[PDB]
Every structure is written in C-alpha cells, then in structure tokens.
Amino acid sequence: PWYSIFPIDNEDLVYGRWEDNIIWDAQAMPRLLEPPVLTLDPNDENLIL
C-alpha cells in the first residue's frame, strides 16, 4: 500500500478540542475568541485546489 488503503479522517475532528469553541455563557466566556481565516484544506477531494 504505497498509498494508505484505510480512509484518512479530519485531524481537527479526530484530535483538536473543538469544545473550546462551545460558548457556554455569552457574558462570562472563559477564552477570548478570535476571527477565523479560511484555510482551504487540500486533503479533501472535490476541491479543485
């Protein structure tokens, strides 16, 4: 398998803590959030680039 036969999963979903973006309380929100830039992941097929 010079190419992995098994499917490759979203590293951010599999590994990242997307639970730091859950806004539990609007007023008292523990972590100051920042604007997110578009990252255009190229791992996904169906995207020309």
Partner: protein
C-alpha cells in the same frame, strides 16, 4: 493558506500487517488462520 497534508496514524508496516492478518483471518488456509489468530491473541502493539 492550506493546512498540511496529514498522515494516517498507522505505519505502512502496520497497515500491511493489518492487511495480511485480515486476509489470513478469512480462512483460505488453516495454518495461516491459526497463526493470524495467535498473532491477534498476543501482539502487544495491537492497540491503536
């Protein structure tokens, strides 16, 4: 900005091992099955 091309969490020796063990465990030959079953029964790195 493009996020880096990620790698599978298995190695290609591990992925080849998985392919050999699964193609032996579908029981085309009985000695192949029995080793593959013992390999499943005592591989320490069979987690992940």
């Amino acid at each position: 900005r493009l996020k880096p091309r990620s790698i599978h969490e298995l190695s290609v020796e591990q992925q080849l091992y998985y392919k050999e063990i699964t193609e032996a465990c579908v029981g085309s030959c009985e000695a192949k099955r029995a080793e593959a079953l013992q390999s499943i029964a005592t591989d320490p790195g069979l987690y992940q």
